[model samples]
Target: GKELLLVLYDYQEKSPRELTVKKGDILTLLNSTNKDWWKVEWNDRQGFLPAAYLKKLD
Candidate 1:
């Protein structure tokens, strides 16, 4: 099963491949192979987001 993450802060995408997430948004963690970045899905959209921006949901 995939992990659920909570967005810690609002993040504006710096690139087209990145996702913009707002604080309190819940995201599905699709991949975490990258140390600094992670692939997540939210609101029917899939894109990369900074790993630091998300927190694991218990």
Candidate 2:
């Protein structure tokens, strides 16, 4: 499932505000595991958001 993560604030969807993300700047949990090695910071929160879910916008 290759999907782009955007800091896009769709007025119709009103979703993922700050949703517009740059391919080289934004990142997602590439793998789904509760492991620390495969984890990173997002919005100052420490959580495993599945790296595999991070798709580049461009």
Candidate 3:
């Protein structure tokens, strides 16, 4: 977990199960597996997002 936070300004998702992030938002990662989908938390909500969308934080 490394206290990482993800930022998204224009993240788009296709399904209701996808993680919706906002501009200038700081997100917290919850869990992940399979190297494709990750469980992330943002705005008090939790959902799945593509692992490819995430990057190393500052």
Candidate 4:
């Protein structure tokens, strides 16, 4: 199965270390054990994103 997902809306980073995801950005889900956060890869970097801000893709 594929592990790709999409960002539903624009999001700015809270800090320098946080990932900045914009609307329509494609992300690969790396981890999702936590309800509030998910580890994702974008722009060739790994960072954490809020689960609510993402949508699954087939």
How high is each candidate's TM-score?
0.92, 0.27, 0.69, 0.86
lDDT of each: 0.93, 0.36, 0.70, 0.85
Q: What ranges in model 4 sit over 4 Å off? A: none
- Across 1-58, the per-residue lDDT of candidate 3 in tens digits comes to 4446665455787799886665556667777664987777877688877776775474
Please give the distance, in angstroms, between residue 30's alpha carbon in candidate 1 and its true position after superposition: 0.3
Ranking by TM-score: 1, 4, 3, 2
The pairs that clash in candidate 3 are: none
Over 6-36, each residue of candidate 2 has an lDDT whose tens digit, in order, gives 3222112123322333335454443335442
Write the candidate numbers in order of decreasing lDDT. 1, 4, 3, 2
Instruction: State each model's C-alpha RMSD to the native.
Output: 1.0, 9.3, 2.5, 1.5
Off by over 4 Å in 3: 22-24
lDDT by residue (tens digit), candidate 4, 1-58: 4499899988887866558988999999988898888888887888888899999896
lDDT of 4: 0.85
Give the range of the ten consecutive residues with the poorest summed lDDT in model 3. Answer: 1-10
| C-alpha positional error of residue 19 in candidate 4 after TM-score superposition, expressed in Å | 0.8
Clashing pairs in 4: none
11: Cα error in model 3, Å: 2.0
What does candidate 1's lDDT look like per residue over 1-58, in tens digits?
8689999999999999999889999999999999899999998899999999999895
